[PDB]
Design an enzyme around this catalytic site. Sequence first.
Site, short mmCIF file in Angstrom:
data_model
loop_
_atom_site.label_atom_id
_atom_site.label_comp_id
_atom_site.label_asym_id
_atom_site.label_seq_id
_atom_site.Cartn_x
_atom_site.Cartn_y
_atom_site.Cartn_z
N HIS A 142 0.83 -1.20 0.00
CA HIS A 142 0.00 0.00 0.00
C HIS A 142 0.88 1.26 0.00
O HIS A 142 0.67 2.18 -0.81
CB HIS A 142 -0.96 -0.03 1.21
CG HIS A 142 -1.76 1.21 1.40
ND1 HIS A 142 -3.14 1.25 1.25
CD2 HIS A 142 -1.40 2.47 1.76
CE1 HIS A 142 -3.58 2.46 1.49
NE2 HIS A 142 -2.53 3.23 1.80
N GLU A 143 1.85 1.32 0.90
CA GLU A 143 2.67 2.52 0.99
C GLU A 143 3.54 2.73 -0.25
O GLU A 143 3.62 3.84 -0.78
CB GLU A 143 3.56 2.48 2.24
CG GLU A 143 2.82 2.25 3.58
CD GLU A 143 1.71 3.24 3.91
OE1 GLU A 143 1.51 4.25 3.21
OE2 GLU A 143 1.02 3.00 4.92
N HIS A 146 1.77 4.25 -3.10
CA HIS A 146 1.65 5.70 -3.11
C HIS A 146 2.79 6.32 -3.92
O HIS A 146 2.58 7.31 -4.62
CB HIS A 146 1.65 6.29 -1.69
CG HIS A 146 0.33 6.16 -1.00
ND1 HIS A 146 -0.84 6.64 -1.52
CD2 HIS A 146 0.01 5.63 0.22
CE1 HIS A 146 -1.84 6.40 -0.68
NE2 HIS A 146 -1.34 5.80 0.38
N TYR A 157 -4.11 14.39 -2.92
CA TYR A 157 -4.55 13.64 -1.74
C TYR A 157 -5.66 14.34 -0.96
O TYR A 157 -5.50 14.68 0.23
CB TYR A 157 -3.34 13.36 -0.84
CG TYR A 157 -3.50 12.15 0.05
CD1 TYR A 157 -3.56 10.87 -0.47
CD2 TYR A 157 -3.57 12.30 1.43
CE1 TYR A 157 -3.70 9.76 0.35
CE2 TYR A 157 -3.71 11.19 2.26
CZ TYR A 157 -3.78 9.93 1.71
OH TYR A 157 -3.91 8.84 2.53
N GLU A 166 -6.06 6.52 -2.46
CA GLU A 166 -6.13 5.51 -1.41
C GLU A 166 -6.57 4.14 -1.92
O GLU A 166 -5.96 3.13 -1.57
CB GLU A 166 -7.08 5.97 -0.29
CG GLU A 166 -6.37 6.74 0.79
CD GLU A 166 -5.25 5.92 1.41
OE1 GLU A 166 -5.54 4.80 1.89
OE2 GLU A 166 -4.10 6.37 1.41
N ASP A 226 -10.11 13.77 7.61
CA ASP A 226 -9.37 12.78 6.82
C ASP A 226 -9.16 13.26 5.37
O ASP A 226 -9.36 12.52 4.41
CB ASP A 226 -10.11 11.43 6.86
CG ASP A 226 -9.39 10.33 6.14
OD1 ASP A 226 -8.14 10.30 6.18
OD2 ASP A 226 -10.09 9.49 5.56
N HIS A 231 -9.63 7.98 3.23
CA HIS A 231 -9.63 6.59 3.70
C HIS A 231 -11.03 6.05 3.93
O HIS A 231 -11.20 4.89 4.33
CB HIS A 231 -8.86 6.44 5.02
CG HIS A 231 -7.41 6.80 4.93
ND1 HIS A 231 -6.94 8.07 5.23
CD2 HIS A 231 -6.33 6.07 4.58
CE1 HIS A 231 -5.63 8.09 5.06
NE2 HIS A 231 -5.24 6.89 4.68
N1 LIG Z 1 -3.68 4.67 7.40
C1 LIG Z 1 -5.00 5.18 7.72
C2 LIG Z 1 -5.69 4.30 8.74
C3 LIG Z 1 -5.19 4.49 10.12
C4 LIG Z 1 -4.02 3.67 10.48
C5 LIG Z 1 -3.51 4.06 11.83
N2 LIG Z 1 -4.38 4.96 12.68
C6 LIG Z 1 -4.92 6.62 8.19
O1 LIG Z 1 -3.79 7.15 8.33
O2 LIG Z 1 -6.01 7.18 8.35
ZN LIG Z 2 -2.55 5.26 1.89
ZN LIG Z 3 -2.23 6.08 3.96
#
Ligand SMILES: N[C@@H](CCCC[NH3+])C(=O)O
Ligand SMILES: [Zn+2]
Ligand SMILES: [Zn+2]
EC number: 3.4.24.27
Length: 316
Positions: A142-143, A146, A157, A166, A226, A231
């Site tokens: 996932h990372e 990005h 983003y 995402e 967010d 997300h």
């Molecule tokens: N990676 C996502 C889900 C949370 C992971 C840790 N709180 C975020 O930064 O919102």
């Molecule tokens: Zn991400």
């Molecule tokens: Zn993320």
Amino acid sequence: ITGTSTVGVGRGVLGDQKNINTTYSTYYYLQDNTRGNGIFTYDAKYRTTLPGSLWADADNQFFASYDAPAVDAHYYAGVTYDYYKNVHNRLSYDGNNAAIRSSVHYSQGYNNAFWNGSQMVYGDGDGQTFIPLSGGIDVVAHELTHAVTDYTAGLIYQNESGAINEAISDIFGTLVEFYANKNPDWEIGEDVYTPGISGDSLRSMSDPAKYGDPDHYSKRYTGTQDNGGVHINSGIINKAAYLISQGGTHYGVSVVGIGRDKLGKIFYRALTQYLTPTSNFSQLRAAAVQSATDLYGSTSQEVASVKQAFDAVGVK
Ligand SMILES: N[C@@H](CCCC[NH3+])C(=O)O
Ligand SMILES: [Zn+2]
Ligand SMILES: [Zn+2]
Ligand SMILES: [Ca+2]
Ligand SMILES: [Ca+2]
Ligand SMILES: [Ca+2]
Ligand SMILES: [Ca+2]
Ligand SMILES: [Kr]
Ligand SMILES: [Kr]
């Protein structure tokens, strides 16, 4: 560093043994010279200065508990490199074999991981919400995805383009998890999330609503939390991708599945040839339809399934 390529051995976050590519020069470093311009893993030593120190080990054995997050960040970066190269003919995240850098032991009790524009960064978790996050191959992929997105579509983003950003990371994080083929699923982060609770995860692609995320455009989040719900609204696209691969009937709309490999081809092509920094969900549908048309033809089942999937989640 300059040295000779070696092969160390250690244990990852979940206690599994694996071989890792290292470099020897006085110490053994977490530096894999076998993939492109290198995969480099660093110790942030519980602080937030980045990248920290290139990981050095006296004996090329990585079995200490402190070693485990480094072993997995290093190893799963390798798997992710292999996925993009073998499956999409892409050489690292920039397509020109850019060095892949990761830091582990970021901060204290840090319940997250991220790509910071230049490298991957992994917290250790607080031991309750998370264990060290590099333990999840879908998280690592996932990372790094990005980074791929940033060098290709460049999806901003925030709001819908951010939610696509995402979803692309959850989609390819999951396809890398299937590629490695160790207990793969359509959930995100299950291997490192809540060690005291079995069977949960951070997000679900198969049923985003299980964790409160929308599975239809009509339930999209339009507030400011967010980054405009990147997300959260990702669930709408994650559901569409899930349906394209696996099929199903969703709010009465039936989708014929075409499988993971074709999902991957269609979305990789959309990401690299059609999506732009400002693409919204409607434009993603158009990009996916055109990608599927390029690959399989305008009257193909693949195109029909892409259309049904976006219909099913309310994206016209
Ligand atoms: N990676 C996502 C889900 C949370 C992971 C840790 N709180 C975020 O930064 O919102
Ligand atoms: Zn991400
Ligand atoms: Zn993320
Ligand atoms: Ca050692
Ligand atoms: Ca899994
Ligand atoms: Ca998973
Ligand atoms: Ca759990
Ligand atoms: Kr690389
Ligand atoms: Kr990559």
